[PDB]
Design a protein around this ligand. Sequence first.
Ligand SMILES: Cc1ncc(COP(=O)(O)O)c(CN[C@](C)(CO)C(=O)O)c1O
Ligand SMILES: Cc1ncc(COP(=O)(O)O)c(CN[C@](C)(CO)C(=O)O)c1O
Lengths: 394, 394
Amino acid sequence: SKGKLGEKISQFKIVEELKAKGLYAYFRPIQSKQDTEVKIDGRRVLMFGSNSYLGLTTDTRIIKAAQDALEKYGTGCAGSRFLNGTLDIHVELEEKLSAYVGKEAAILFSTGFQSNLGPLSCLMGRNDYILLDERDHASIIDGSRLSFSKVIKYGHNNMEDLRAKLSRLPEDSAKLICTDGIFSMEGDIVNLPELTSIANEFDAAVMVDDAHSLGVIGHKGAGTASHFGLNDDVDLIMGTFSKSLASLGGFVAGDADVIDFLKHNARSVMFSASMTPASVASTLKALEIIQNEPEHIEKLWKNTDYAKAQLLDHGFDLGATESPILPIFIRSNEKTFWVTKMLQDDGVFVNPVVSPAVPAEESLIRFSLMATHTYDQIDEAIEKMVKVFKQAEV
Amino acid sequence: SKGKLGEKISQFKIVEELKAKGLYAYFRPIQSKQDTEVKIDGRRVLMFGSNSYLGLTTDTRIIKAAQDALEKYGTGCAGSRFLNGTLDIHVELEEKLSAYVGKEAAILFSTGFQSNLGPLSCLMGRNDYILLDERDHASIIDGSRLSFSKVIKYGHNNMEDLRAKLSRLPEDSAKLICTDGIFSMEGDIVNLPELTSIANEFDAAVMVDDAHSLGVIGHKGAGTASHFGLNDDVDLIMGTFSKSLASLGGFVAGDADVIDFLKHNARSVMFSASMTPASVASTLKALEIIQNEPEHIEKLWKNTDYAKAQLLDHGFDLGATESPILPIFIRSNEKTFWVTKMLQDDGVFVNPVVSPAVPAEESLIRFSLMATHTYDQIDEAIEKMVKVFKQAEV
Ligand SMILES: Cc1ncc(COP(=O)(O)O)c(CN[C@](C)(CO)C(=O)O)c1O
Ligand SMILES: Cc1ncc(COP(=O)(O)O)c(CN[C@](C)(CO)C(=O)O)c1O
């Protein structure tokens, strides 16, 4: 029955208003492979809104690995890893990821989102505490909500606030600090040295979500702990397969005893179907390529350095990025929507960040680099971004 | 840091004890396609522990559709549907599913698990109520936890308890009842006529999770509402792609205004990468086959009726199944583990159900049928199940 339900959703008018004004640019239907140029409405559009940082979703070798796994293993495992859904290739990928991030063991999940829900839901219990950076990914907030522990947020990369909040807690409780490694909105990196120093002083567990770090920072792309040399001081490395690794799924890597506990207690692995064979094989081959062909991470960083320098030359106001995410401040929700749609209609795809996710005065567009971008594509996008910011009067 | 973390997991000894006794049968590593016979350790094993009810993960046409989508679209969309992750084929699948279950609109999720988290997390808020059957899937419990509403459980298929609990609630609040359609443990069907009668009397929203119903009950497999003719009285039909539909992902289907609210407010669709092209195409082709080739649902039911009658003839104690899930009571955790591993070593895969998921006296094995099973395979499994129950003394 719909009376009260109709009421609950009656106040949500922003999509109706964006569509009526001709500004709506969510769920844009792409007709081609994810690539530096995509087809939308039969038109070619430059993609600067992706998370495919190394451009590997189009690699013929990765496509072939996925097609070969469909031929051997079929379209799906039809159950949880716990029961009838484990393949020899799931276990191969866990071993390969464990070796990559320098940990004893790993457990896969069918999504990155589910990879955060697992450990955050089941390690800390009644009378325990989870400490979250206030800018942590939604999956981390939600995982922590699913725990039976007390969740405390600390100020973004604020080590005094983290120290103070931990200082207030009973000695006779378990603590877990969970942080993004690279934070996707502004593209900044966690202060892992000071966070891990604090963790060690309070005997708190440390988990890092490397969604945006894998294939980007660290030796051969191995992530945020690898970037700082702090493998030893991080208990759990979480990552996802949907960004650099060009696939779908995620993992948590850690000590064999912790991972064994997780794989038998995390509801998001016990009660959800396992990764498709095609996604296991695509992740396996992508991981091989990232490690063996250093040119991908190199070209991503050459594109990042070039685009950041060109943006600052043209006088764009950038956020404090340390990554291939270039946040360009606009500071008006209305202008952010207008700029996004005008760039779309001029053949440039960027991602808006608006209220209520951020204050209006901190609204921005995110311009993300891939290794496969050319300096010419970057120049064409920045040209068009100069023209639209002028027409919009920023 | 690991001190307190080491303590939190120190008491979890059941896996260490199962492995040491040679009884462990979780995460069994399959070396072949999910099929009526699988390869484990180079040995052939009969699969009666699957959710591939129509046996479609091996259909050459579905494999080919998935391989063709990899060729055209690559290995992954590399972002949320909300931003850069929507393909023309996502929208095609939403339209096809909406038509199938007789609803205005649908939104996909990258997992079934995530398809429950979306609506349950974001429709009911502060001062609202979610009513859950006590045997609801873990994904439904967790989705409801992620809401800011008051979650109330009612006795399993207990319509007096549901009526009473709803009667106690303020008139001036929104209510949502969420139920499995087929409940996977005992294989029983929700009393949808009485639940929807109660919902209509209290103006409560109704959501049904058709994970185990799609491709099983309803006209051409269209699910639990279709089974009862109650399309009109169910607000939201949720399903998954990982069972009959031989893939990975899920959906929620409903009125256009509700679905539009969900696709812009559900954290599990806004903040998680979209389904792989290979999984969209495999789901599309599987859905076409289920509707066009009625023989699959027919043979599933012929196998279900044959196996249930053979089991009852041999005097097995079955649960109150109305589905291709045949729950066989053992009523001892120790005997349940022993029976499961002895059947595994004799070439028969079944799924155990033990404490703490159920009371020891209600421990059982689940024996699940696929359309592709033969009467000879069924006879061989039941033969072996007679022998092992004898050796175990049940
Ligand atoms: C009733 C319902 N609802 C939702 C889901 C989640 O779907 P997903 O697996 O993510 O595609 C399951 C998964 N059920 C499985 C995986 C098999 O029954 C389990 O072991 O619990 C389920 O049984
Ligand atoms: C930091 C972190 N952690 C976990 C995830 C979940 O991974 P999954 O997408 O399920 O593979 C995301 C997804 N992030 C995306 C999808 C792209 O940034 C987003 O729009 O929020 C993420 O940014």
